[PDB]
Design a protein around this ligand. Sequence first.
Ligand SMILES: [Zn+2]
Lengths: 143, 198
Amino acid sequence: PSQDNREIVMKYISYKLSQRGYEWDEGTESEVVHQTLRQAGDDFSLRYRRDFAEMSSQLHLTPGTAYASFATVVEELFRDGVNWGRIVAFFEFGGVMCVESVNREMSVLVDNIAAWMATYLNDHLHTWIQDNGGWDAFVELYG
Amino acid sequence: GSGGSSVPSQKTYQGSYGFRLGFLHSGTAKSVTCTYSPALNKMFCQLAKTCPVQLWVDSTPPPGTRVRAMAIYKQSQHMTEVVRRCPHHERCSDSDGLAPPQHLIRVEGNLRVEYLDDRNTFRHSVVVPYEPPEVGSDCTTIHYNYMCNSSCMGGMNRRPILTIITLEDSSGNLLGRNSFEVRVCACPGRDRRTEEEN
Ligand SMILES: [Zn+2]
């Protein structure tokens, strides 16, 4: 559960960074839950680029940034309730924060962003996900 | 069937902020996704494609202001029927992960979008926060999607609708309102040029 949520975050970040020159750490490439989330998040970075830019403008990411600032930005994302679309935007925002810090030559911030996402997922989103059909219900709609 | 048959109003109200709507001067060549006829105050568009609508304002509304969109049928004998998606499109797989499947009007490109199913009127609406124009611009642009054709049998069934745009505050009180006719077709440019004659 807590480990299970940690894994889906790190696999999401591993793929995004690997799709650029950055390497970071049976039938896992085709795993259906993660595969459709990656395809959904790739769509989201294009359509909501304005929003993600604003969110990372608010999240003035530096080595000194604490969890609380990250939590503040993503909490605004769910203020009106949780849905699959907003959860996808939660994953893709973390991905763009990770690519941004690698591009700004602050690669060790990737570990912090990854731990924050897993923390926020376990603390605030996991109960909603289990109550609304689990990840299987997400793939049933493909979003 | 509207809750209590209490049709929402469509009267223009520019209000204290000089609220008006603007539209792109796109032509009528049949490769047009979206174009607005000023003579008919009617927008013609294709399903699930972008319809830019601009919000013009002479004095900036305060933060916390919101922009709501709602559809109603134009002919008076149908104004009491709630505008919904056809059953076929409501069941098809086109969820954006934000809009409930039954809503006809969507906003794309806005993470802060909100969809309402009214507990009294049973009418659908979509809400986003108002934001001042960007630098270089003089208006705020919203990108709308209509998720049924006007011809969809079992939904609109060739009945013309109107979209009603309202400026509200945090409490939902009225700050302004504008409206325009909508035809979601297959060939928007040919249909505008056809109707813009006879
Ligand atoms: Zn339809």
